[PDB]
Design a protein around this ligand. Structure first.
Ligand SMILES: Nc1ncnc2c1ncn2[C@@H]1O[C@H](COP(=O)(O)OP(=O)(O)O)[C@@H](O)[C@H]1O
Ligand SMILES: Nc1ncnc2c1ncn2[C@@H]1O[C@H](COP(=O)(O)OP(=O)(O)O)[C@@H](O)[C@H]1O
Ligand SMILES: *Cc1cc(-c2ccc(N3CCOCC3)cc2)cc(OC)c1O
Ligand SMILES: [Mg+2]
Ligand SMILES: [Mg+2]
Lengths: 386, 383
């Protein structure tokens, strides 16, 4: 038994899900495309059409959901939205969600970028949760994309939802609240379900308390060291400590394998032809022996060490010698003994994974100690300024 | 085996139909809605995207279909357009068809309004025909509407064997007005073409040969529809009316509109001398339309009641119209017998009189062309 309320339309029996404060989402229609229609009480939730229009008038971003149209029933409010296949919950939780075929880390790239698109428009979500990060229906060749939804709306008379509210929002808003929320959903995605804060009932209590677990992030694993390093700052209690929408996009956490490798190359080149006394080099061996595992030479595979023994001239007590060795080996890769190629290669995936496997703090240490050269013409693909 | 050439997508197994000169149309996708994608060879047809872009940058007309986006394969050209239910063909010829939902004259109306909107944009369809008028899939509350398609593209002679205005063989909107005339007949006739069967169609059109066999002269609606289509399929390009002129024609009027015309005219003609040029023009056709004496060509209750006042000449058009208007006005206080024969207003009533004087509206219309500029007669007449 269908309803109209013209310019939008739906059937009430096809209900998708109930939201906060008595709002309901069904599967309706529009032109003829399948749509999710969100039906809202105007006294509870407050749509702000101005922001949404600004979204429309500006260049369409691929990871920020589009609102079809808005009309005000007497006692209600009606929104027609691209029917998505699921929310982030189905993704990380159901596990059966046949991707396809996107990685969680690109998922977070998408999300953070879309969010950044919002923040460029000086627009803040106020309620970033796994339910407000939706997944498209499969596209042409079957690929899936992630968009943020439920933006530009709020509550009259605290916004957001229990569990995903920043600390400072609960003590008598800018982008930072969205960056905190985003850190949480990052952990929720990476950690296959666990919340950093950590159980449902205690979650927000610990948010104000400052309790974090993060126990999924070992210290002997590269990717975990990176993830931890970023999320640590995203969910920092001090809102001034939280990284901006773009800043997060620029993190090593997002880099491709090739990008990490190239990072190691570039770094090795730029540190070469400068004195050991210089600021950069001295700083690069600041953490020193720690990351290298004392001497890097014995901590690597056999053939590689036979070649290196044949050539070095490589202290091993230095990270810089390691970097330089990696750059040399990457460069001269093709003209190397086939066994060496077998252990190292292929470039760049297996190559760089071969070193970050064995030195989990290498990329991190290099990246941080090389912040000095952040302004140089080469490193703007790597670092942020303002 | 899905095809991409993004952003469009289709299965070459779900073909909807072959087109002209190799082009074909399949049921494809876009965002996530079903669409129809027709592929063309860019070596045959030349798209003018300035026109379609101009369509986009102008007001959305409910009867002009929309081409979603245009893009080029290396070897092909792809157009994705709103997926429709059928063409005029299935509308007319498929005996078990759901309109649902829409009358044929409302169909033609829609078609002509979309057509007029196109013409307003200084774009000429160049190829009007049934396949190029389409039926939409049911909407919100089920209602089907009709949209015109395949406009804005041409061939590297435009048109189609059967519907091509003769002077294009020996272009302006007049061509579309002519093709439109053809489709008007085609629709109203429930299957027939004026010119009139397939192979001779274009021979007979260069000839000037018309059929119009299904339009009698004893049925009012026939006389009107004919009166228009004739002017639409006139072999002289400057004779055919403009796309809006076609719309303003009595053919499209509602019954309320018709009876309102009759009353307005009857109020106007009155208090003007009988030698007067307007009234004299009105009685030029005279007897023939009035059937000698209109008193004798109505029901017996009405005439036995018209006896009591007349005053009603009966050979005269003005007097019939004025009797209509007077009996209309004083309807409340008429005997139940007379009320009953006339039937409820305006439907049964204006039909009561149009039944018996099929030429009456056509005649009064043409005769009242005299006062076309008047501020009361503008809802009826062209400018
Ligand atoms: N755009 C959408 N498309 C499809 N399903 C949706 C959409 N938005 C929400 N849903 C589903 O409907 C439910 C209600 O969502 P919503 O009204 O946004 O409140 P909340 O933000 O608390 O989930 C959600 O759990 C989600 O699973
Ligand atoms: N939007 C549409 N929806 C469904 N079918 C269509 C559509 N457009 C065209 N067709 C089908 O494609 C066939 C021919 O394609 P086209 O070149 O557009 O028409 P024609 O060749 O008759 O001018 C028609 O007979 C019609 O059935
Ligand atoms: C790993 C590594 C490799 C070289 C090196 C490799 C290959 C060449 N050539 C030039 C002559 O032979 C053909 C290819 C030269 C040098 C050098 C170093 O550094 C000593 C090194 O670490
Ligand atoms: Mg939501
Ligand atoms: Mg067609």
């Amino acid at each position: 038994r269908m309803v109209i309320v013209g310019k939008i339309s739906f059937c009430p029996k096809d209900v998708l899900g109930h939201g906060a404060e008595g709002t309901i989402v069904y599967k309706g229609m529009f032109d003829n495309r399948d749509v999710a229609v969100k039906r809202i009480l105007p006294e509870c939730f407050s749509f702000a059409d101005r922001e949404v229009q600004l979204l429309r008038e500006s260049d369409e971003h691929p990871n920020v959901i589009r609102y079809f149209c808005t009309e005000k029933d007497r006692q209600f409010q009606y929104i027609a939205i691209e029917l998505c296949a699921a929310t982030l919950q189905e993704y990380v939780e159901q596990k059966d969600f046949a991707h396809l075929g996107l990685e969680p880390i690109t998922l977070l790239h998408q999300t953070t970028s879309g969010l950044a698109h919002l923040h460029s428009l000086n627009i803040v979500h106020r309620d970033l949760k796994p339910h407000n990060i939706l997944l498209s229906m499969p596209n042409a060749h079957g690929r899936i994309k992630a968009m943020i939804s439920d933006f530009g709306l709020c509550k009259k008379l605290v916004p957001g939802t229990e569990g995903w509210i920043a600390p400072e929002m609960l003590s008598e808003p800018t982008y930072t609240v969205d960056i905190f929320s985003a850190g949480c959903v990052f952990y929720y995605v990476i950690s296959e379900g666990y919340h950093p804060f950590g159980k449902s009932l205690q979650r927000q209590a610990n948010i104000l308390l400052g309790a974090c677990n993060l126990d999924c992030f070992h210290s002997d694993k590269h990717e975990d060291v990176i993830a931890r390093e970023l999320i640590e700052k995203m969910i920092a209690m001090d809102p001034q400590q939280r990284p901006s929408a773009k800043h997060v996009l620029k993190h090593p956490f997002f880099w491709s394998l090739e990008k990490q490798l190239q990072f190691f190359q570039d770094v090795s080149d730029r540190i070469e032809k400068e004195a050991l006394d210089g600021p950069i080099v001295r700083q690069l061996e600041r953490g020193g022996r720690a990351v290298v595992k004392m001497d890097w030479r014995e901590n690597i595979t056999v053939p590689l060490q036979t070649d290196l023994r044949k050539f070095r001239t490589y202290k091993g007590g230095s990270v810089r010698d390691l970097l330089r060795a990696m750059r040399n080996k990457k460069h001269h890769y093709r003209e190397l003994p086939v066994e060496v190629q077998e252990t190292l290669g292929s470039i760049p995936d297996d190559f760089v994974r071969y070193f970050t496997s064995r030195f989990p703090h290498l990329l991190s240490h290099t990246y941080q100690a090389m912040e000095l050269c952040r302004h140089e013409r080469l490193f703007q693909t790597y670092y942020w300024h303002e």
